[PDB]
Design a protein around this ligand. Structure first.
Ligand code: HEC
Ligand code: HEC
Ligand code: HEC
Ligand code: HEC
Ligand code: HEC
Ligand code: HEC
Ligand code: HEC
Ligand code: HEC
Ligand code: HEC
Ligand code: HEC
Ligand code: HEC
Ligand code: HEC
Ligand code: HEC
Ligand code: HEC
Ligand SMILES: O=S([O-])[O-]
Ligand SMILES: O=S([O-])[O-]
Ligand SMILES: [Ca+2]
Ligand SMILES: [Ca+2]
Ligand SMILES: [Co+2]
Ligand SMILES: [Co+2]
Ligand SMILES: [Co+2]
Ligand SMILES: [Co+2]
Lengths: 519, 519
């Protein structure tokens, strides 16, 4: 090889970048590391892009100076069970098939594994692209580094000649859409307007042909999702998160006004031909809660339906790219606010929300969050070295693998066995309430066809359908959320007991109605 | 089983015991645990003992209520190399046979092993009783609990019919005498007057037939050596220690007057027929430096000779039970204060001191000692229990076995590997200097016969004999001291460098004199 460009020349038309670049810890880092802009420079004016310069979005673009963080970022935790289906007695949600009915998640919902695989896994999961995309080889499942280097080096398209979403295997679904990708990659960061709105400068939008968009995307969880590449400063880039914090007025910590003042997101808008195009959110502190909260939150990234009239809410509507940014007890109200539900249960006919990994919103208010602990403290701490610069690890994983750093540094009276035991006590307890919430909800769901077939009245079914909304929300939050209660045990406990209460109620109401109908 | 005695009835005559017993943590502990005094009570007067009560001196007498401490006390560290001779390229003093000459230690000087064996190893070492006492079987070498229960359960006497010290094997010596036993056992605590003086009330004294004494003795390092059995309070019982510290006013920390004020021995004297018989030294705090310094010090416990006139100093003289109570740099002067040396080197003719394990006097003034660390902090810490009362371990051993407790609790920036490495750095460095001090001293010694045979003058010989005393002292201190410099690395270094300097001077004078003599 690389030959530096004259950055001062760049600054002549890129004051917004200069202001970020010259002030930060990348002041000495030349644009050529991340951009090829020779023809751009030859052809541009301050008012005309000329040739579009290339922006290198590979995490490997950072590995020439930050190999340690890159290597950690690419690493694979073999102990994290790969491709393990949750609808399964060995996993999170043994009754998930009954509970979720014909939702796309019924086609496959595996447990999470290492970050390196996130784009790949998104592409190949059975629910996403109808089986269109597949590992080139079952051997490829191990290759975290190959995945980081580019999805398409390890997976393949069954039919590169067509772009339509269809099933290639009988038990697959085509739930993927362009919004999904925002939590898998930011390769498209310069090609996607804020919120995924259609925009003249945006190749890709909420309404794009997701198969064509998929083909343009390569790298998982880009290094620049958390670090501004020009200033180095901590940031978020995820549109829905900025929208929640800023546009919705909710603040960084919606349940703590002081903390929302202590931890700040400063939006920065970049323009195209003078029009607002894309945004980022500069953090005043490297708050991993927000960094991780770009993805580990409950969201819409899918069409749905309006609670008011059942009208479809398709990808063209911003509500299909939305963070609720709310705890489990506020979720129903948040969803009601945007007049939105995900799906109608196939058996019971109840409009339902569909819950996805609400780790941040669960973590809010927990003792750990109340005390200033962030996701990275337990999942992504600094390495420990007798004689080394102690950099931050970059592939988040269970604190079980690093108990001294993750727990024992703070809990200095405990042994590693005790700390793990405290984890398991909570997880076990919660999992037991999940099993009971599933038992009861499944009972209620199973009673629906009996009720309908015995001629139970719409009024009664409609009451149960209402209960089903809260029973479902207050169960699924917990199979969706991946800490099995650890992140907020009192909350998991209250919520799951609520789900069970609702479900028992619906069962009693169904039973009474069936017995009456039959009498 | 045991029936409690009427303590009050004892207290009528035993007023000092009452004072100690009723006020401490053994107030509820009946005399019958440690004494069988029925015939005594029936026969005693205010002044005559009458029938002698039995005192149970086994550590096992404490085990009924202090099992944890007893079990730890009896435990055996297998990794402490057993019966390993120091005069050995694999051990402390490869040139020891040259350096110590005809001294008794030349018959055997093994490295220390676990406390449980101390009395047995004293009885059976080749230098002690002419090989009279032997393990009943080589199998018995592992039996630490057996040894604690009584030496004579695991060892035997080659000739119970005679009491004279003589060799039963060709390469043994009969170095033992009754003073030795004070650092192996206190079974004889009621049978030995303070200092081992001949005394009407003492069955055993400095001048006793040691073989007869030996047969009267059973247990190692009795629990009551450090704990008063009546009050439970920390104490010492070793006469020569109390003599140094209290009688001679040298203080518990003779190099630190302020510390000697803060750590104190309060003498308590017990009489027999109204004359002073035995003493203990009650500690104001449980300072294990003083507890351990009952044994881990440099001492006389052997006949020797006067520096002034060469006259023998036999067991009758109190100097044969003496704690020098001096660091390596003050030792020569302390030996002069008692006009004493141990042996004449068989080759050089030099009067020499014989140095034995001066761990405490080495420890004085070390960084750790200065910061109030004690022997037990590194060698006998509390056990660590997740869920138990954490008692003190009671078989002292290398901190290598228990680094978290011994080192890493105070040195929390260090890993176990780092703390060991620091240990090894000092031991290696020190060992290196001991090997060089050996090389030079041996070279000096070996030159003496060449000098003598060349006709070198007594004046030159005498001057090199004076050098030998210090060359020896500043060498042997360190093979005697079992930490290989760790206890005081800067002192070991200065002193070993002094030994070397003296030896090189000695060699230079002998070489010059031999050269002149031959020419
Ligand atoms: C004026 C003569 C320019 C100079 C000198 C440089 N750039 Fe530029 N650049 C310029 C314009 C008018 C635009 C378009 C802004 C808009 O309204 O859209 C750009 C764009 C970029 C981009 C983004 C391209 C994209 O994918 O949207 C990059 C990464 C970029 N420019 C980099 C860049 C570099 C590294 C330069 C020095 C080698 C440089 N530009 C000079 C105008 C001008
Ligand atoms: C890697 C460490 C980078 C270096 C060094 C430089 N740039 Fe950059 N740039 C980088 C990325 C990954 C992106 C995508 C957007 C994001 O925020 O991550 C960009 C973007 C730009 C743009 C477009 C900004 C916009 O209007 O949307 C421009 C104009 C730009 N970069 C210019 C630029 C210049 C001039 C640099 C040398 C001073 C430079 N970049 C260095 C990554 C990296
Ligand atoms: C060398 C040519 C680099 C490239 C390519 C990338 N980074 Fe960098 N980074 C570089 C330097 C010399 C420094 C300063 C280090 C220091 O000691 O001050 C940095 C710093 C960072 C930081 C942290 C700044 C801090 O707060 O300590 C980050 C987060 C960082 N760099 C990120 C990063 C990313 C994401 C990159 C790929 C887009 C990247 N760097 C490339 C040198 C270089
Ligand atoms: C979107 C770009 C994400 C960001 C930002 C963070 N995470 Fe993540 N995480 C994400 C996905 C899509 C997955 C599943 C990946 C797959 O292929 O299955 C994960 C997974 C995890 C895990 C589990 C890893 C394992 O060993 O199973 C953890 C512990 C995790 N994520 C935590 C985490 C932390 C602490 C983050 C901030 C530092 C973070 N994630 C950001 C998506 C994204
Ligand atoms: C950010 C708000 C995300 C959105 C948008 C999408 N996903 Fe996601 N995904 C996210 C996280 C934090 C995780 C790990 C936690 C968990 O429940 O696993 C995931 C995980 C996946 C996985 C791996 C596990 C699995 O379900 O098999 C896949 C295959 C996946 N996600 C696919 C997927 C699809 C198809 C999406 C659009 C409909 C989508 N994700 C969006 C974060 C986010
Ligand atoms: C959000 C999920 C992140 C992603 C994506 C990347 N990094 Fe990171 N990085 C993150 C955190 C929480 C931290 C620690 C910040 C703190 O002050 O506590 C870091 C730190 C760095 C650094 C600084 C040195 C260090 O502590 O290791 C560098 C140079 C860095 N990160 C680089 C980097 C690279 C190269 C990435 C892609 C491989 C990358 N980061 C992604 C959070 C996140
Ligand atoms: C320490 C108090 C933690 C905080 C801070 C965060 N998490 Fe956590 N998480 C924690 C535990 C003990 C567990 C269970 C892990 C185990 O081995 O049993 C988890 C689990 C997760 C997971 C699933 C990981 C896995 O099972 O391998 C994820 C995806 C996760 N946590 C994410 C996450 C987020 C996003 C956080 C900030 C909002 C966060 N965790 C903080 C402990 C702690
Ligand atoms: C007065 C009639 C006494 C009574 C009542 C008890 N004891 Fe005694 N004892 C007495 C004398 C005069 C002596 C000699 C020492 C002295 O204090 O002058 C002793 C000695 C002992 C000893 C030490 C024995 C030894 O081997 O040296 C012990 C252990 C002892 N006594 C115990 C003891 C007990 C337990 C008594 C109540 C059962 C008791 N004594 C009563 C005088 C008298
Ligand atoms: C073990 C826990 C004991 C208890 C209970 C009692 N005694 Fe004791 N005693 C014990 C030992 C090991 C010794 C030897 C000396 C020493 O200080 O360790 C003694 C000594 C005595 C003596 C002799 C004191 C002297 O003049 O030399 C007497 C008189 C004595 N003990 C009395 C005594 C009484 C009356 C007790 C019940 C109240 C008692 N002891 C309990 C061990 C233990
Ligand atoms: C039961 C009949 C016991 C006999 C035999 C021995 N000890 Fe004891 N000891 C006993 C009790 C009930 C207590 C008090 C426990 C408490 O903490 O309240 C003790 C205490 C001690 C102590 C500790 C004093 C302290 O400062 O904490 C010591 C050092 C002690 N005992 C020593 C000891 C010895 C050496 C024994 C054999 C001679 C012995 N004890 C026997 C109960 C009993
Ligand atoms: C206290 C001042 C002691 C006197 C009196 C005696 N010994 Fe000793 N001995 C003492 C300690 C602290 C140690 C461990 C340190 C060491 O140099 O090993 C020992 C060790 C022994 C051993 C075992 C190692 C060995 O030398 O083979 C034996 C066999 C031994 N001691 C015998 C012995 C003899 C024969 C004594 C009178 C001449 C004698 N010891 C006195 C402390 C003390
Ligand atoms: C000196 C070399 C000792 C020998 C001989 C015995 N013990 Fe001990 N003991 C010693 C120390 C340094 C300590 C810790 C004191 C402190 O305050 O830190 C102890 C402690 C005890 C206790 C108290 C409870 C505990 O800490 O474990 C008891 C009950 C005790 N020791 C009993 C005991 C027994 C039964 C012994 C013979 C088996 C014994 N001690 C010998 C030092 C020494
Ligand atoms: C005289 C009764 C002693 C008392 C009081 C203390 N120690 Fe000792 N120790 C003594 C001897 C005679 C020996 C040699 C034993 C043998 O048979 O060889 C020892 C040995 C040790 C050792 C070495 C243990 C090993 O595993 O090799 C250590 C570390 C030691 N001693 C330390 C020590 C401590 C800390 C003491 C006070 C708590 C202590 N000893 C007292 C003799 C005596
Ligand atoms: C911590 C700062 C210590 C203090 C306090 C005491 N000792 Fe020590 N000792 C220490 C070390 C690191 C070593 C070397 C052991 C090793 O494994 O390398 C020793 C050694 C001894 C030994 C020989 C033990 C053996 O090598 O197995 C003895 C007999 C000994 N130390 C005795 C002792 C005494 C009596 C103490 C108080 C005067 C004392 N030590 C304090 C570390 C420390
Ligand atoms: O599909 S993702 O949100 O788990
Ligand atoms: O001989 S003793 O002092 O080891
Ligand atoms: Ca959702
Ligand atoms: Ca000596
Ligand atoms: Co599993
Ligand atoms: Co999931
Ligand atoms: Co050895
Ligand atoms: Co020795």
């Amino acid at each position: 090889q690389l030959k530096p460009v004259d950055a001062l020349q760049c600054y002549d038309c890129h004051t917004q970048i200069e202001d970020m670049h010259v002030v930060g810890k990348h002041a000495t880092v030349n644009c050529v590391h991340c951009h090829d802009a020779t023809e751009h420079v030859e052809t541009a004016s301050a008012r005309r892009m000329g040739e579009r310069p290339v922006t290198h979005t590979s995490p490997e673009a950072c590995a020439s100076c930050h190999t340690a963080q890159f290597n950690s970022f690419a690493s694979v935790r073999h102990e994290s069970h790969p491709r393990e289906e949750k609808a399964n007695p060995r996993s999170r949600s043994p009754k998930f098939d009954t509970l979720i009915g014909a939702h796309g998640f019924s086609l496959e919902h595996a447990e999470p594994r290492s970050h390196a695989f996130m784009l790949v896994d998104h592409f190949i999961v059975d629910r996403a692209y109808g089986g269109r995309f597949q590992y080139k080889s079952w051997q490829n499942v191990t290759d975290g580094l190959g995945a980081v280097r580019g999805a398409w080096t390890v997976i393949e398209d069954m039919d590169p000649t067509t772009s339509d979403q269809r099933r290639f295997l009988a038990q697959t679904a085509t739930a993927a859409n362009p919004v999904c990708l925002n939590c898998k990659t930011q390769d498209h960061i310069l090609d996607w307007a804020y919120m995924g709105d259609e925009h003249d400068a945006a190749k890709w939008a909420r309404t794009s042909k997701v198969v064509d968009f998929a083909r343009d995307l390569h790298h998982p969880v880009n290094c620049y999702m958390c670090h501004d590449p020009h200033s180095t400063e901590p940031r978020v880039v995820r549109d829905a998160l900025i929208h929640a914090v800023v546009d919705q007025g909710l603040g960084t910590y919606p349940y703590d006004e002081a903390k929302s003042e202590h931890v700040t997101l400063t939006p920065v808008t970049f323009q195209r031909g003078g029009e607002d195009f894309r945004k980022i959110g500069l953090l005043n502190v490297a708050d991993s809660n927000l960094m991780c909260g770009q993805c580990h939150v409950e969201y819409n990234c899918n069409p749905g339906f309006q609670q008011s009239d059942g009208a479809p809410v398709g990808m063209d509507d911003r509500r299909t790219n939305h963070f609720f940014w709310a705890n489990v007890f506020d979720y129903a109200e948040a969803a009601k606010e945007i007049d939105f539900f995900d799906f109608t249960h196939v058996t019971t006919g109840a409009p339902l929300p569909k819950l996805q990994h609400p780790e941040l919103e669960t973590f809010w208010g927990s003792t750990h969050e109340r005390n200033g602990v962030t996701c990275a403290d337990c999942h992504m701490p600094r390495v420990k070295l007798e004689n080394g610069k102690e950099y931050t690890m970059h592939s988040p994983r269970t604190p079980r693998d690093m108990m001294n750093r993750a727990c024992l540094n703070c809990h200095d009276g405990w042994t590693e066995a005790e700390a793990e035991y405290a984890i398991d006590y909570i997880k076990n307890y919660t999992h037991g309430k999940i099993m009971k919430a599933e038992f009861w909800l499944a009972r209620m769901i199973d009673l629906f066809p009996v009720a309908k077939r015995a001629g139970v009245s719409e009024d009664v079914l409609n009451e149960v359908r209402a209960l089903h909304y809260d029973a479902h929300l207050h169960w699924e939050w917990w199979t969706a959320e991946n800490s099995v209660g650890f992140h907020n045990p009192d909350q998991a406990r209250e919520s799951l007991m609520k789900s069970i209460t609702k479900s028992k109620e619906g069962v009693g109401k169904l039973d009474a109605a069936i017995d009456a109908a039959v009498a």
